[PDB]
Design a protein around this nucleic acid. Structure first.
Length: 65
RNA sequence: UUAAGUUAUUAAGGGCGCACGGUGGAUGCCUUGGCACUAGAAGCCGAUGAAGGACGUUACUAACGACGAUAUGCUUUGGGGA
């Protein structure tokens, strides 16, 4: 998942960020209830958010020059 | 049976020796770190916010490292081949 991101509009980038955060908050918020058995899934999510914001920032630069 | 004479047996415990352990950690051997130096480079960092630090970040997480709310790491460019 590196150039799935490059296929975006610079506006869809925001929405998948938000929805990924709600996905996450669902998991974090279940997590102390113990409903969750999945452990390593969260890393994938948080890393995705890192990617989306990274690329958004890079294009933020190259839309500045 | 008598008088006289002599004399050892005892080891509660101790000493000498001999053995078997226990204690505690020297010596022997080794190095996971260091001392002193040669050749060569480099000899600065910072208001475009340092050096140094606080608080946090892991699936469960107390500490060191690593990192900083994009958080136990992100993208790219090369290298490498489970």
């Amino acid at each position: 998942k590196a150039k799935e991101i490059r296929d975006l509009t610079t506006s869809e980038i925001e929405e998948q960020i938000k929805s990924s955060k709600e996905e996450l908050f669902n998991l974090r918020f279940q997590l102390a209830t113990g409903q969750l058995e999945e452990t390593a899934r969260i890393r994938t999510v948080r890393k995705t958010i890192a990617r989306l914001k990274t690329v958004a920032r890079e294009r933020e630069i190259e839309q500045s020059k």
